[PDB]
Each structure stands twice: as structure tokens, then as C-alpha cells.
Amino acid sequence: MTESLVLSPAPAKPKRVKASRRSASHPTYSEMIAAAIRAEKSRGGSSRQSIQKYIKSHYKVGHNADLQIKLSIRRLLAAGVLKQTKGVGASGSFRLAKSDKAK
Amino acid sequence: SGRGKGGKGLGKGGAKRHRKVLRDNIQGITKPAIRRLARRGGVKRISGLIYEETRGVLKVFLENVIRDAVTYTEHAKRKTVTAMDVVYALKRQGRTLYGFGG
Amino acid sequence: TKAARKSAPATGGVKKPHRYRPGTVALREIRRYQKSTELLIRKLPFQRLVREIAQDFKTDLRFQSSAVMALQEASEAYLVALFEDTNLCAIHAKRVTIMPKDIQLARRIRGERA
Amino acid sequence: VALREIRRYQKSTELLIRKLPFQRLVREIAQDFKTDLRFQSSAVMALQEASEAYLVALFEDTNLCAIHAKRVTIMPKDIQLARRIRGERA
Numbered sequence A: 001m002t003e004s005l006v007l008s009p010a011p012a013k014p015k016r017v018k019a020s021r022r023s024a025s026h027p028t029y030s031e032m033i034a035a036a037i038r039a040e041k042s043r044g045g046s047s048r049q050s051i052q053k054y055i056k057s058h059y060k061v062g063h064n065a066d067l068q069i070k071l072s073i074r075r076l077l078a079a080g081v082l083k084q085t086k087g088v089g090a091s092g093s094f095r096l097a098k099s100d101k102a103k
Numbered sequence B: 001s002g003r004g005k006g007g008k009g010l011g012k013g014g015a016k017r018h019r020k021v022l023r024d025n026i027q028g029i030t031k032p033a034i035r036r037l038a039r040r041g042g043v044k045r046i047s048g049l050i051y052e053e054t055r056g057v058l059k060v061f062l063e064n065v066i067r068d069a070v071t072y073t074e075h076a077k078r079k080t081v082t083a084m085d086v087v088y089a090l091k092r093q094g095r096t097l098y099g100f101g102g
Numbered sequence C: 001t002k003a004a005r006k007s008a009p010a011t012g013g014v015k016k017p018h019r020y021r022p023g024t025v026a027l028r029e030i031r032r033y034q035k036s037t038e039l040l041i042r043k044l045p046f047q048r049l050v051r052e053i054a055q056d057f058k059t060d061l062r063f064q065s066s067a068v069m070a071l072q073e074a075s076e077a078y079l080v081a082l083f084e085d086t087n088l089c090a091i092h093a094k095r096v097t098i099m100p101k102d103i104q105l106a107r108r109i110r111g112e113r114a
Numbered sequence D: 001v002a003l004r005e006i007r008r009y010q011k012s013t014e015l016l017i018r019k020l021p022f023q024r025l026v027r028e029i030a031q032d033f034k035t036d037l038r039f040q041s042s043a044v045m046a047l048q049e050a051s052e053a054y055l056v057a058l059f060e061d062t063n064l065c066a067i068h069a070k071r072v073t074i075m076p077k078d079i080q081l082a083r084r085i086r087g088e089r090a
Helices: A012-016 A033-040 A048-054 A064-079 B029-040 B048-076 B083-091 C024-035 C043-057 C065-092 C100-109 D004-011 D019-033 D039-068 D076-085
Strands: A082-085 A093-096
Touching: A033 A048, A033 A093, A033 B048, A048 A064, A064 A082, A082 B029, B029 B048, B029 C024, B029 C065, B048 B083, B048 C043, B048 C100, B083 C024, B083 C065, C043 C065, C065 D076, C100 D039, C100 D076, D019 D039, D039 D076
Parallel strands: none
Antiparallel strands: A082 A093
């Protein structure tokens, strides 16, 4: 049970992390990458070390930071809400689908 | 006519009743048939274009072999190509099949 | 928090069948078909095809069941040998997939593209 | 420069390997089979033309092997594929 067996020992993280009244942490659904991209400046896309940084503080590392980051990147790519820039000096520069200027 | 876009119901799309009288004769080799040939060749994954390419390659081989067969059959006035004719049309270049003959 | 509208929790995994991972079935399919000895393609779709091209080259003629088998086995081994030949071209191109780029190169070296 | 000399060899027909080193090479191979073997001048030159065109066809195929793999250079990997796929080596 991906939703019950693994979440049985993991109500501890929810009572302290994710959304709460007044200023709090962003949910895993959205703003984990979107708000990070909004907050960062002088980037032109977010690298892996970058994203792993901008998620500091109270957060579930577990196997989530190991694989669900890549899985969510692919999921958002399937959505099309993520724009990207390629290179090898930086492993990957992923941006939001911000329509301030038409592509 | 069709009660739905999908294949859940009766004959929404691709309802076929004509059996290759003058159509789809070349398309007698289906996708698993091409896959099975690839598997016997040790191929793990093939592309979409290989389905049409193999049929084109298949037509060339049969055409080249049967070009000799009609000449072989007409020469002996037999008008009925047998196992021997295929070997004669094959033994000349490569593909020397020992399965039938004699 | 069960949103019940977004599939990030993955909603439910109760009735999901045990499906093989992509490319894993090919591993077992290789061992099954290489050992297998059956005639790969059906006789009738092949039978009507060879008759048609023969009809174009020569007027109405008869066929024997042995002749159909001879054409099938030589043709099947011709493709299987080509498939292995293109398979070695696939790894040389550093990728598993096989496309006309693989077949065209294979048909050229072994004298077919002439 | 390398393609500059392509025109020279593809426009003019000539032997591209040294004459006597080929004669010495075939002699040393023949001596092991049978010592004191006598080679005719026409025979050694006839084998040279066949040998040269044998590699030209091999070098022609390996060129198309490279372009298949998004490559320009031909490497030992290319020569392995061409010989094996042709049935010459395996």
C-alpha cells in the first residue's frame, strides 16, 4: 500500500511540515519547486544542488529526496508547467512556465 | 452508428468483414509476427518504422526468388512450382535450404 | 491530507495488477523464441502474397504445399539473420532500438543494397 | 586536405601500396606453407589489385558504419561490424 502502508509510520512528518495556518511550509503538491523558482534570482533555471538547498529546514529527506524529486520533475514535464534550459556546465536548469513574455 | 469513441461497444471502429480479396495482401504480417522474428534475432526493442520496412524487405526477397521460379517452372513446362523449384531458385545465391529436395 | 483529486499520493494501489516493467518481457521472450522451432508466420497470409507476385510475373499457375513451406522457412531465416545483423548495428550505434538506419547499413555491407 | 586527396585517388587509378613489400609479405606467408616457392611477376601484382580493392570495399563499408553511429571516424569497432555482418570473420 503506497498510500497506507508507507504512510502508517509517516504521520509524524505531516503534523510539523507542509501547510499550516499563517506562514508555513509549502505542500508537496505545488510550490515545492514553483515557489523555489519564484524565490531564486540570477539562476535562469534551478540545478539539482540548488533545489536540494532551497528545500531546507523541516522536511522529509527519506527516500523522497532520493527519487521523488526526479519523479516529480518528470511528472511536471508531462504536465508542461515547467520550462527548461540545457547545458553541461550546469547539469540542468529548470524554470516555471511563466508567461510574462511570449515564447 | 457508433455508441462510443472507444472499443467498449460493438464495432465503433475498424469493423472488418472483407478478408483480403484484393486488399491488405502485403499486410499479412502483423506486429507480433515482426516482433517474433526480431526476438529470434536477439532484438530487444524495434522502432515503428521497422514494421513497414520489414515488409518492403520481405517483398524484395520473395520477388527475387520467385523471379527465377517462374522461369524454372516454365522451362520444364510443369506450371506447378514445387519444393525443388524453390531450392533451385534459392541454391543459386545464399539461402541454400536443405529442408526439401530429392 | 487526502485531496482525492490529485494523483501525487498515487490515489489507490489496491487493484493494480502486477505488470512487467518495460523491456523486461523481451528478456524472457528471447529465450522462448530462440529455443522455439515453430513456423513463425501463418501460411495463408503468406500463401496469397506469393501467389499475387507470381501472378504479376506469370499468368495463372498452380502451387504445392511443399513449395509454400520452402518459401516460408528461407524467408523467415533470411529475416532472422537480418534482424541479428541489424541488432549488431544497433549496439554499434550505441542504442537498443532498430530503425531503417540499421537495416539500410546491414543491407549494404552484405550485398543486398545493390 | 584529407578530402582534397579523395579526388586524386577517385579520379586517377593507381596502386596505393608499395610493390616489393607486398611481394615480400606474400613471399613470407608462402614460404611457411611451402619453402622455395616461385612467384610470377603477374601473379603477385594480380593479388595486389584484388587485395587493394578488398580493403577499399571494406573502407567503403566502414565509412557508412560510422555515419550510422553519428560518427565520421572509423575505429576498430567499425571494422569488427563490417567483417562479421558480411560473414567474413563470423
